[PDB]
Structure 1
C-alpha cells in the first residue's frame, strides 16, 4: 500500500453539509460522503495515525467494510472521505428501534446484522487483519429499514497499533486484557460480545459491572447470561466465542455457518423480541 493509491480529492470539490457525531460530517464532492476530520490542534502522532487509517481502509474490498472514497490531506483540516452510512451506528439504532408498547424489528433482522458483521470479520481474518475493537458502536448501517446492510466502520483502534482505563475491556478476551496478546481469536471474542449487544437491543455488556469487576469475573470463568428472549442457538454462538482458550474459539467461517443455520430455524426467527 502506498499514498499513491490514495485518491486525493481537491478541497475545492468538497462541501460539509451537517455534523453527524463528535468528528464526522456529511459531505458532498454530486457524491454524498462521510467526512472524518483530523483536528488542526493535533499531536504529531495523531497525523501519522490519520494517514494510517486511510491506507488501512483503502486496502479493503468488501461489502461489509465501509468504503474509502478518497482523502483531502494536502489541505487543512485533513479529511478522510468515507461511505455515508445513513442508518448511523448500530448501538444507537438498536436503542432507538427497541419495540415499545406504542409500537419494528424482528429476530431475522438481528441475525442479518450479525451475519453482515461476521462476513466483514471473516474477510479481515482471511486478510490477516486484527480489528481489535469489534463493538456495536463501531458498526454502521446503510439505512434504518428492511434493506439495511451493516458494515464495520471504525478502523482507529487497529491503527493505534491511551491507557489502562481507556481499554475496551468489556469487549476483550483474557489474553488481550492480561497479556496484551491480539490474534484473529481476539476478534472472535469481541464478536461474541457484539452478538450480545445485538440480541439485547443495545444494552451495555455486563450491566452494572464496572471494568475491574468484569476483568475479575471473566478471568474467573464468569460469562454474561443470555439477553432477554435470546434463542438458545444464538446464545450458544456467544458462549463458543467466549471460550477461555483462544484455540477453542471458532473462526469466522464457523461463526458464519452457525449464524446461517440460525436464520434457517423457524423456532429461532419466530421468537418475539421483548418490549
Structure 2
C-alpha cells in the first residue's frame, strides 16, 4: 500500500485530550517509544478525509505539525508529532501567560509567520489562522496545525476573518494575513478575545466603516502598525508572510532597539 501505513497494534492511545462530533484526539505512543498525537475519524466524514492527509504527506516544514503515520482503512487513525503544551490560546491564558513578555511573544509570532510563509510559497490557504489553531511544544516552539483536515472537519470565527473572505468568500493567503494581524492581538493581550465587548454583527459593521482595534496596553506602536498593515482594506496591499517573518525576527534590533520590559509586555 503506502510507506505511511502502520499496523493498528503499533499505536497505543493513552490520554484523551479532545472531543469532536466527527472524531477524537488522543495523546499516545507509537512503536512503544515515540510519543504522538492521534486523530480518529468516526465511521461522519467520507473517504475524502484521506485526500486531506495526503496533503499532510506533501507538506513538510519545521513550523507545521509533522505527519508521522496513517491507518487509512476505516476506522481511520492519523498520527502526528505531539505538541506538549496544547493550543497557543490555552498556553497564553494559562499559568505561563503572566511570564511571557514581548521578546517571547514576538519570537512565537515569527515562528507562526515562518510556518505561514511556507504555506504561502506552496500556494496554500489556511482559512482559520488564530491562536486556538496554533500548537505549542517545549522551548516555546509554535506550529501551524492540520489546516486542510481541520477545514474539512469544520464543514463562526468572523472576528479573525478578513471582511472580503467573510462577505464574498474570497479566502486567499492575504485573508490569512488579516487573520495573522488578529493573532498578533491575541499574543499581546495574552489570549483575550478580539474586539472585546463587541458581538459578531457589531464587528462586521464597524470593520466595514474602517474601525480597527487600537494599540493594546504596553504594546509598542510599531507592532500595532504591523497589525494595521495586516488589516489593510485592499488584500494586495497587506504584507507577505515572508515580510512578516523577517520583520518579526529582526524586531528588537531593527525596530525596537530601545525596548525595556514592563509589567506585562
Aligned to 2:26: 25
Matches of 2:137 and 2:236 in 1, distance apart? 34
Q: CA deviation at 1:226?
A: 1.8
Matches of 1:60 and 1:273 in 2, distance apart? 40
**What CA deviation, in whole Å up to 9, does each residue of 1:71-130 have, x standing for no partner?**
112242x1110110001110000011232xxxx222111011100000000000000000
User: Residues 229 and 156 of structure 1: is their aligned pair in 2 closer, same or farther, counting only changes over 3 Å?
Assistant: same
RMSD of aligned Cα (Å) = 2.0
The runs of 5 or more residues in structure 2 that have no matched partner are: none
User: Residues 133 and 157 of structure 1: is their aligned pair in 2 closer, same or farther, counting only changes over 3 Å?
Assistant: farther
Matched, 1:39 2:34: no
Matched, 1:246 2:235: yes
Q: Partner of 1:169: helix, strand, or coil?
A: coil
Q: CA deviation at 1:160?
A: 2.9
Q: CA deviation at 1:271?
A: 3.2
Matches of 1:262 and 1:236 in 2, distance apart? 13
**What CA deviation, in whole Å up to 9, does each residue of 1:118-163 have, x standing for no partner?**
00000000000000110000001112xxx22100013247743968
Aligned to 1:137: 132
**Pick from 68, 89, 92: which aligns with 1:91?**
89
Q: Partner of 1:205: helix, strand, or coil?
A: coil
Matches of 1:226 and 1:157 in 2, distance apart? 34
Aligned to 1:160: 152
TM-score (norm 2): 0.90
Matched, 1:271 2:261: yes
Corresponding residue pairs, total: 256
Matches of 2:104 and 2:264 in 1, distance apart? 14
Matches of 1:35 and 1:58 in 2, distance apart? 15
Matched, 1:187 2:185: no
Matches of 1:273 and 1:113 in 2, distance apart? 19
Q: 1:135·1:191 contact (CA, 8 Å) conserved in 2?
A: yes
Matches of 1:63 and 1:15 in 2, distance apart? 25
Matches of 1:34 and 1:162 in 2, distance apart? 19
Matches of 2:63 and 2:201 in 1, distance apart? 33
Aligned to 2:8: 11
Q: Partner of 2:147: helix, strand, or coil?
A: coil
Q: Partner of 2:62: helix, strand, or coil?
A: coil
Matches of 1:133 and 1:14 in 2, distance apart? 29
Matches of 1:52 and 1:137 in 2, distance apart? 24
